[PDB]
Design a protein around this ligand. Structure first.
Ligand code: CL
Ligand code: CL
Ligand code: NA
Lengths: 297, 295
């Protein structure tokens, strides 16, 4: 079972999520969802397993997504999500069942990359688990047109209009900057995945993002920030057949880490199925084993 | 002669600056000050020259600095300044004396690097002038301590305290992250420079920044964003004896630009004197020549 737990940020926004408590006092895993995803997608199954193995688990809706505060809505600023995680760590660490000396950050897809940036600056984070992290976003041939569209949206907003919104993946699987498989099979699979959250769980899931998201992604240089993560024990889980985040891009980042680390390839899996189907129970067990070994108080 | 001109941002902040207009309809130069600097520091002299040579010139206080809106005060967020420059370009381009097809972004020190980031995304920017751009900020040896201090300031803010504030350079020339000459002669020169500003005729100057500035600088990868500037003609003016931003670091960035470009080294100058004293007239003339040659 879970309780609703809210964390305040330094600018006064409320982040909302599910807290799966354990009896007594024990470690805590804070799980960040993927790009524009809500906490109810896929992660509750993982959190229940974590909880049954003795880990407090917090799944939350990031800023401007789902149940959480934040305006404009579905404006995905990965660097703001990274800073928000410091404030989430502060509140989760204060809870009665949480051992503030055994905090782990866990992230899937976009959220794994966000979690790494938070880990870079926060020594309270004792381990980092990245599942299928996404590390690049722009296709070079699309850059200038996307930048132009961004500037035009600013001009429209200055005239008094609300921020331009769009589905992160259209029916061709595409989006203006070419991210996450756009133009290929990955983008079509993401389109179907986002459009097939046509099912209960989450009243505040919205299959749209602010175009200005792409401005934040233009600034973000996560491969450079990951180089600051030079002490935090890190587990990376990469799908062999990831059509949204190139596996060799994930491997290239993993190879650079100098500290204690572990790599897991999920054979035959894609970006969205890496934690589903067969092999998944073994992958989750591998995560709790890595956390148990490296986050020992 | 100048007029006060305000520019609204998409989130509703008002940026305030001085607009040096020219008769008729002419090109425009938007000048971004250095780190925590106000528009009255040095730039008005240069703006008067630009104006006399036919350029509408806008010098402004960036967000949370000087006369401009923004809270917390003196929180230097380079990426937000870059985005604010798009909205500044929008309003300046709309003015009656401004030819919207001939906009130049100009920046000194930190403001030169911010200007480059705005030029990367905004094709309305037709030329880019960077004076002594600063391209790195952290000393690796200070990073863990500075990050810890940042997290503790967040917790202090969560408990209800105001954001921690501090001078960008203390009396040893130092600061928590080791930026801009900290630990060497450059930081000591910056300390004395910042300490003399109010006595030198700049009222709205506040010689303190929000510590959370350093969080923004930890995320910023300006050397990578400058690689996106692959079409805008760029003039870089580097002081030979810059002790705050290593000239070889400035030159390494200049080498990567594939488009039309020009490099000027100011002999015998440092980070703060590159546009002062002997040779400054020729340097400023080179800037307007470069803009006309490419704009
Ligand atoms: Cl308890
Ligand atoms: Cl504790
Ligand atoms: Na393009």
């Amino acid at each position: 079972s879970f309780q609703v737990v809210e964390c305040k940020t330094i600018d006064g926004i409320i982040i909302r999520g599910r807290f799966y408590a354990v009896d007594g006092k024990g470690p805590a895993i804070i799980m960040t969802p993927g790009f524009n995803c809500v906490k109810e997608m896929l992660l509750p199954d993982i959190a229940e397993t974590f909880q049954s193995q003795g880990f407090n688990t917090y799944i939350y809706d990031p800023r401007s997504i789902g149940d959480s505060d934040g305006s404009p809505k579905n404006l995905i600023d990965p660097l703001q999500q990274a800073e928000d995680l410091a404030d989430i760590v502060t509140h989760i660490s204060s809870l009665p069942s949480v051992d503030s000396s055994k905090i782990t950050l866990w992230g899937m897809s976009f959220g794994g990359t966000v979690s790494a940036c938070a880990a870079a600056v926060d020594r309270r984070v004792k381990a980092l688990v990245m599942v299928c992290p996404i590390l690049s976003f722009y296709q070079a041939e699309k850059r200038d047109k996307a930048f132009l569209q961004l500037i035009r949206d600013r001009q429209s907003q200055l005239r008094g209009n609300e921020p331009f919104m769009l589905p992160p993946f259209n029916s061709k699987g595409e989006n203006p900057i070419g991210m996450a498989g756009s133009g290929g099979p990955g983008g079509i699979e993401a389109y179907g995945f986002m459009g097939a959250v046509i099912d209960r769980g989450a009243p505040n899931f919205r299959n749209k993002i602010a175009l200005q998201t792409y401005q934040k992604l233009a600034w973000w240089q996560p491969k450079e920030i990951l180089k600051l993560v030079d002490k935090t024990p890190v587990l990376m889980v990469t799908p062999e057949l990831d059509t949204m985040s190139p596996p060799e891009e994930q491997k290239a980042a993993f190879e650079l880490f100098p500290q204690t680390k572990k790599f897991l390839e999920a054979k035959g899996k894609g970006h969205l199925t890496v934690l589903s189907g067969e092999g998944s129970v073994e992958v989750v067990d591998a995560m709790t084993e890595f956390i148990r070994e490296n986050v020992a108080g």
